[PDB]
Each structure stands twice: as structure tokens, then as C-alpha cells.
């Protein structure tokens, strides 16, 4: 640090090295700390960042390398970017993008290196809030409004006309639903959520189809039911998307995998216990047919049936023929199978939810910046060039990996020094005046 | 409640516990609350072939009694 | 492992069910065997369908499942 | 939940182990004709169709450092044992 600082205090030109590696690039590549501290501290940083590197992507922008390699240095730099007085001022101008470069290039760099201490840094948080309240909130509100433009008339019309058939209020509702569905189709044209909205939009298309050609009533009403139910589910999805954190969509994949496993395990256990109960309790009327048995055992797992009269009372009158077997099936199905299945399912859910509670906890900012860059890239330049802001004011009234890493570098320096010293001492013996004790 | 309410309304209009959308939302409120007779209300009409949407109604039933509450309790217990 | 004794259960019971091909067997025993055989048949087939997947975590936790069931089938009776 | 967490770690690292186990058992209990016929060597895939070893490294580096320092100390002892201490004798 002393060498670089002393050189910079004097005239010491900064130039390309024909490898597209500036002196700052070399300082950062070698993971050096005090030199980068003395270059942030000292002046001429505007000039040092000015030279940049734009030809060979082998050495990227200085800010991106700064993010990737030394996090604490950018922590100090952003601390210097924060201003106090409590007139808190955010200087910006160090997160800036120079117009393969993405709009939020520094943010993408910091979220693809999981440097959480910099994502939760106050300046980046305010930057995200500024971008949100500038354009992201407006765009998301526009999307939700275009969706509600189809949601509201669907509910109104389903409440209006009694199902079971194939005054201008109906026509207005139908035309609103058609235009909203077509607009959403266009939006999607321009993950599980994707197939979900494809389901909803296809079903809305089926519901609006009798505007063109005749469709049977029963199919129309089946489509209407599935469409309304999925409409409200999707709107709950969007209302969750209102919140910045998207943990719910993250765990929705776990939800759907658990549902896929359950919708087959439950059917198979229904079938198994169905024939078991059929051959076991044939003497009674609720098991006369195998179909009756599977439906009634479906009721048994569903949660409502009278155990006393159906099972236990016939035992006392000795009208039942398999006491041990029937009681074994009863205990195994009511307090052995559901308890174990709930234990297994809760264990799987808790493990995956803990995994999410860590990964999505460090990736909330990542998904936020992801949707922000996607929105900016798919949006024209007029809006961004008009709303873009640089200054903000906030009023009060309105842990071991890097330490072991540091130890490793210090020990490497120590062993280099000791090797040099040993070579030096060998130099000492190789020319000595050994005469008195020769 | 609202979603499953209209779903049950348009799905089970043939019966009396879904005559009005208000009746449907209140009775489905009862369904999530925890006390209602499933046998007579749903399964028995299937055998006499008085119901018109077997697959859809059974899908709604399974999704609301052993697919939605299980997943919601799992999610809530995980967060807690 | 538990799967071995499980399939031994199923195969023995299937043998009892096919026994009246050779010699006469009382009907009640035959139907008891049929019930246990069918129920274990479907349970074993669910086991195999899980074995379809590469990961065998379910069979791994099945030992925990059976130990919990062994504790419960006595604690519940005693209570 | 305790046992399921234990499984979610052990079986997570042992899924591949049980897979290879059943594969070797199947291969050993199968004749050689099928394997000698189906055995393949090449495959193509198309896109469209953390602290134990660091402390261990530190331990080896420190062992090397202390060996070097022991040798250097012996060397310096060699330096004293033959010296021309006359001016300050």
C-alpha cells in the first residue's frame, strides 16, 4: 500500500498494458486489500475509473471485478457513497452503468456472487426502492390492471347468469373478457406460473368462444368453473407478487411436487384399503360393491363417517366374523397410516422449506434485480431516460470463510518470506571466512 | 373461500346448498371450518347418477380437503 | 431389510391363496389370506413404484416409519 | 423431524451410493453376453431435446513451514559452531 500510495501522490500515469489489464485490474486479481483501500482513500479515482476497459472482455469493467473479487472494498466505497449531516443523502454515481452490458450491470454482478452483505447494504436497498417506485411499480400495476380487466367481468357474469344454459351487460362483460384475454395472450407471447396462465388464458378463450361459434352448454360451464377457480388462484399469485419477496413462488415448486406424489399415493392407498375393506367387511351394506367400498373408504380418508355403529357396535352382537383383522385394519388406517403420512410429508416440507428459507433469503434481491433488468430491457428508452434519478433523501420522521481465507493468504506470505530468508542464509554460508575453526 | 365458492356454485348448482352464490360461499366457509356431512351431500348422489360432473366434482373435493389444507398447513408450519 | 420380510409375507400369503389348487382349505382362512394378500400386494406395488425413481429415500425412512409404528402400537394400546 | 433431517443428509449423500450398489449387484448377477453387447463408451448431450479441506490444506502448509524452520535453525546452529569470534572474543 505504501508503494502505490507514494507513487500516486507523485505523477504516476495509468495506462493499458496491452492485455486490457489496468493497474487496478491487477490489484484486484491478486486479491490484495490494503492497496485497494489506499486507492479508494486517495484522489484521482475518477481518472483511474475513467480509463476503464472496453475492448477485450477478458478483464471486465472495474466495478464488476471489484464486486466479484473484493467485497469489503466495495462495502467501504459504498459507505463513502452514503452521506450524512439527519439529512441522509445517497450520492449514487458508483452504481452507475455506462449505458455485454445490462442495465443493472452492477446489481447483476453483486447478486450472481451471493455477496449478501452488499445486497443488504443500505445504498443498494434504496437504489432498488428508487427503481421500483420509479417504473417497476407502474409496470406491475399495469399488468395487474390488465388482468383485473378480465377477472372482474368473469366473476360478475358467472354470478349473473344461472349456470345451465348456452341484457347488454352480458355482452359488455363478454367483450371485456375477450379483449382482456387477447391482451394477456399478447403479453405472454411477448416455470409453473407460465403453464398456469396458459391454462387460464386457454380456458378464457373457450369461455369466450360462443361469441364466434356455437358450443355445447355443459362444456362451456365446465370451462367456466375451471376458469373462475384458476382466475382467483392466479390473482392470489399476483397479490403475492405485490410483495418484493417471491418466496411463495419459490416454494410453489415444492408444493406441486408434493401434490404430484400425493395424488398418486392417496389413490393407490385408497385402492388398496378399498379391496381390503371389501373382502374384509362384505357382510355389511357399505361394502356390497367394490365401487361402494372404494367410495366409502374415500369418505373414510376424507374425514367424516360414524365409526361406532358401522364397526364397533356389530362386534358386541357378534355379527362380525374377523375381529382381529378388522380392528387391525381400523387402527392401521386411522392412527397408523395418516399419522405416518403426515409425519413424512411434514418432514419433507420442513426440509425443503428450510432450504428455501436460506436460498431465497439470499436470492430475494437477485430475483428482484432479475425482474427489474428484464422489465427495463423490454421497455423503451423514453420512459427510463425521463424518470431516471440520481439523488435521494431519507428522513427519520415521515462469518468464518473470509477469516480462514485471510489466514491462508497471510500464511502464504509468511512461507514465501521464510523461503527467501532460507535462501539468503544459504547465501551466507556459501561465502564465509571459516578459518579459525576450519 | 371466494374462489372455491364460485367453483362450487357453478359446479354443484343442481343441489340446494349452492342455490345462491351467498349460500355457496357460506357453506364452503363451513367446509373449511370443519363440520359438514360429505357422504349424503356429495358421494351418495353420484351412485344414483344425479350428478353431472363426476371428475370435476371429485377433483374439487380432493383438492379442497386433502390437497389445499395439507399444503397450507405444511407451508404455515414451515414458516412458523 | 424390511422389504425382504415384506415380500416374504406377500409370497407366503399368495401361496396360501393358491393352495386350494392342490388340497382343500377352509373358506374363512382362504379369505383372510386373500384380504391380507391383496392389501400387501398393493403396498408392495407402491414400494416398487417408488423404486422406479432413482432416489430411494422413502425406503431409507421406512425403517424410521416401522420403529415409530412399533412404539405406537404398544403405547396406544397401553394408554 | 429429527430422523428425517438425518435421512435428508445421509441419503442425500448416499442416493448415488445405493444406485451404484444395485447396479453392481445386477451386473454381477447377470451374464456377460448382455453387458458385452450393450456396453457403450461415447455419449452426446444437446441443450435442446466447505471448510474441512481448507483447514486440512492449512495443516499441511504449517507442517511444511515448521519443517523449513527446523532446518533453518539447525543451519544457524551450524553457523555458530564454526565462527571467527576474535575481535569480540
From Swiss-Prot, chain A:
| Lineage top rank: taxon | Eukaryota
Q: Which cysteines are joined by disulfide bonds?
A: 48-61, 61-97, 73-245
Impact upon substituting residue 81 to S: Does not affect activation by electrophiles
Q: Where is the site described as Important for electrophile activation found in this chain? A: 97
Q: List the residues marked with site Required for C-621 reactivity.
A: 60
- Enumerate the residues binding a 1,2-diacyl-sn-glycero-3-phospho-(1D-myo-inositol): 406-412
Tell me what effect the entry lists for residue 298 to A/T. Answer: Loss of inhibition by A-967079, AP-18, and ASD. Increase in activation by cinnamaldehyde, AITC and acrolein
User: Binding positions for (E)-cinnamaldehyde?
Assistant: 61, 81, 97, 131
Which residue ranges are assigned to the Cytoplasmic compartment in the record's topology? 240-251
Post-translational modification comment from the UniProt entry: TRPA1 activation by electrophiles occurs though covalent modification of specific cysteine residues in the N-terminal cytoplasmic domain. Hydroxylation is required for TRPA1 activity inhibition in normoxia. In hypoxia, the decrease in oxygen concentration diminishes the activity of the hydroxylase EGLN1, thus relieving TRPA1 from inhibition and ultimately leading to channel activation.
Localization per record:
Cell membrane
Q: What is the lineage of its organism?
A: Eukaryota, Metazoa, Chordata, Craniata, Vertebrata
Please give the annotated consequence of changing residue 60 to A: Important decrease in electrophile-evoked response
Q: How does it assemble?
A: Homotetramer. Interacts with TMEM100. Interacts with EGLN1. Interacts with the scorpion wasabi receptor toxin at the same site that electrophiles but in a non-covalent manner.
Summarize the impact of residue 188 to S. Lacks calcium-mediated potentiation but retains calcium-mediated desensitization. Lacks calcium-mediated potentiation and lacks calcium-mediated desensitization
Effect on the protein of changing residue 194 to S: Lacks calcium-mediated potentiation and lacks desensitization
Annotated source species: Homo sapiens (Human)
Q: Which disease is it linked to?
A: Episodic pain syndrome, familial, 1: An autosomal dominant neurologic disorder characterized by onset in infancy of episodic debilitating upper body pain triggered by fasting, cold, and physical stress. The period of intense pain is accompanied by breathing difficulties, tachycardia, sweating, generalized pallor, peribuccal cyanosis, and stiffness of the abdominal wall. Affected individuals do not manifest altered pain sensitivity outside the episodes.
> Per its record, how is this protein called by name?
Transient receptor potential cation channel subfamily A member 1
Q: Indicate the span of the full protein covered.
A: 561 to 1078 of 1119
- Protein family membership: Belongs to the transient receptor (TC 1.A.4) family.
Coiled-coil regions, chain positions? 402-431
> Which residues does this entry assign to the site Crucial for calcium permeation?
304
Q: What is known of its domains?
A: C-terminal helices from the four subunits associate to form atypical coiled coil structure; this region is probably involved in binding the inositol polyphosphates that are required for optimal channel activity (in vitro). The ANK repeat domain consists of a convex stem structure formed by five ANK repeats and 11 additional ANK repeats that form a crescent-shaped structure that surrounds the protein core.
Intramembrane feature spans: 291-311
Locate the Cysteine sulfenic acid (-SOH) modifications and list their residues: 73, 245
Which residue numbers mark the site Important residue for activation by the scorpion wasabi receptor toxin? 74
ANK repeats mapped onto the chain: 19-49
UniProtKB/Swiss-Prot annotation, chain D:
* Sites where the protein binds a 1,2-diacyl-sn-glycero-3-phospho-(1D-myo-inositol): 57-63
Record note on domains = C-terminal helices from the four subunits associate to form atypical coiled coil structure; this region is probably involved in binding the inositol polyphosphates that are required for optimal channel activity (in vitro).
What positions belong to coiled-coil segments? 53-82
**Domain of life of the organism encoding this protein:** Eukaryota
**Protein's name according to its UniProt entry:** Transient receptor potential cation channel subfamily A member 1
The record's disease note says: Episodic pain syndrome, familial, 1: An autosomal dominant neurologic disorder characterized by onset in infancy of episodic debilitating upper body pain triggered by fasting, cold, and physical stress. The period of intense pain is accompanied by breathing difficulties, tachycardia, sweating, generalized pallor, peribuccal cyanosis, and stiffness of the abdominal wall. Affected individuals do not manifest altered pain sensitivity outside the episodes.
In what way is this protein post-translationally modified? TRPA1 activation by electrophiles occurs though covalent modification of specific cysteine residues in the N-terminal cytoplasmic domain.
Portion of the full sequence shown: 961 to 1078 of 1119
Q: Which organism is it from?
A: Homo sapiens (Human)
User: So what family is this one in?
Assistant: Belongs to the transient receptor (TC 1.A.4) family.
Question: Where in or outside the cell is it found?
Answer: Cell membrane
What is known about its subunit structure?
A: Homotetramer. Interacts with TMEM100. Interacts with EGLN1. Interacts with the scorpion wasabi receptor toxin at the same site that electrophiles but in a non-covalent manner.
Please give the function described in this protein's UniProt entry.
Answer: Ligand-activated Ca(2+)-permeable, nonselective cation channel involved in pain detection and possibly also in cold perception, oxygen concentration perception, cough, itch, and inner ear function. Has a relatively high Ca(2+) selectivity, with a preference for divalent over monovalent cations (Ca(2+) > Ba(2+) > Mg(2+) > NH4(+) > Li(+) > K(+)), the influx of cation into the cytoplasm leads to membrane depolarization. Has a central role in the pain response to endogenous inflammatory mediators, such as bradykinin and to a diverse array of irritants.
Amino acid at each position: 500500500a505504501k508503494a502505490v500510495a507514494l507513487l500516486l501522490s507523485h505523477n504516476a500515469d495509468i495506462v493499458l498494458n496491452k492485455q486490457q489489464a489496468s493497474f487496478l485490474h491487477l490489484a484486484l486479481h491478486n486479491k490484495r486489500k490494503e492497496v485497494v483501500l489506499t486507492i479508494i482513500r486517495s484522489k484521482r479515482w475518477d481518472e483511474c475509473l475513467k480509463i476503464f476497459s472496453h475492448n477485450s472482455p477478458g478483464n471486465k469493467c472495474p466495478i464488476t471485478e471489484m464486486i466479484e473479487y473484493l467485497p469489503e472494498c466495495m462495502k467501504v466505497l459504498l459507505d463513502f457513497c452514503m452521506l450524512h449531516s439527519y439529512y441522509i443523502e445517497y450520492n449514487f454515481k458508483y452504481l452507475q452503468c455506462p449505458l455485454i452490458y445490462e442495465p443493472l450491470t452492477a446489481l447483476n454482478a453483486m447478486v450472481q456472487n451471493n455477496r449478501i452483505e452488499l445486497l443488504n447494504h443500505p445504498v443498494c436497498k434504496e437504489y432498488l426502492l428508487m427503481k421500483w417506485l420509479a417504473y417497476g411499480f407502474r409496470a406491475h400495476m399495469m399488468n395487474l390492471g390488465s388482468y383485473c380487466l378480465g377477472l372482474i367481468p368473469m366473476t360478475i357474469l358467472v354470478v349473473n347468469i344461472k349456470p345451465g344454459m348456452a341484457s347488454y351487460l352480458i355482452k359488455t362483460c363478454m367483450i371485456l373478457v375477450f379483449l382482456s384475454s387477447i391482451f394477456g395472450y399478447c403479453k405472454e407471447a411477448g416455470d409453473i406460473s407460465n403453464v398456469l396462465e396458459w391454462i387460464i388464458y386457454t380456458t378464457g378463450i373457450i369461455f369466450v368462444l360462443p361469441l364466434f361459434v356455437e358450443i355445447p352448454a355443459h362444456l362451456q360451464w365446465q370451462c367456466g368453473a375451471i376458469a373462475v377457480y384458476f382466475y382467483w388462484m392466479n390473482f392470489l399469485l399476483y397479490l403475492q407478487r405485490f410483495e418484493n419477496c417471491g418466496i411463495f413462488i419459490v416454494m410453489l415448486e415444492v408444493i406441486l411436487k408434493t401434490l404430484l406424489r400425493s395424488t398418486v399415493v392417496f389413490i393407490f392407498l385408497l385402492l388398496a384399503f378399498g379391496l381390503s375393506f371389501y373382502i374384509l367387511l362384505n357382510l355389511q351394506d357399505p361394502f356390497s360393491s367394490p365401487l361402494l367400498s372404494i367410495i366409502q373408504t374415500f369418505s373414510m380418508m376424507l374425514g367424516d363417517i360414524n365409526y361406532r355403529e358401522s364397526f364397533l357396535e356389530p362386534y358386541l352382537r357378534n355379527e362380525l366374523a374377523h375381529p382381529v383383522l378388522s380392528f387391525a385394519q381400523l387402527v392401521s388406517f386411522t392412527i397408523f397410516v395418516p399419522i405416518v403420512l403426515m409425519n413424512l410429508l411434514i418432514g419433507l416440507a420442513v426440509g425443503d422449506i428450510a432450504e428455501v428459507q436460506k436460498h431465497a433469503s439470499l436470492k430475494r434481491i437477485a430475483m428482484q434485480v432479475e425482474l427489474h433488468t428484464s422489465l427495463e430491457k423490454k421497455l423503451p428508452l423514453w420512459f427510463l431516460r425521463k424518470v431516471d434519478q440520481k439523488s435521494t433523501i431519507v428522513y427519520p420522521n415521515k462469518s468464518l470463510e473470509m477469516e480462514i481465507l485471510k489466514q491462508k493468504y497471510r500464511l502464504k506470505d509468511l512461507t514465501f518470506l521464510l523461503e527467501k530468508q532460507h535462501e539468503l542464509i544459504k547465501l551466507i554460508i556459501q561465502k564465509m571466512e571459516i578459518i579459525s575453526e576450519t
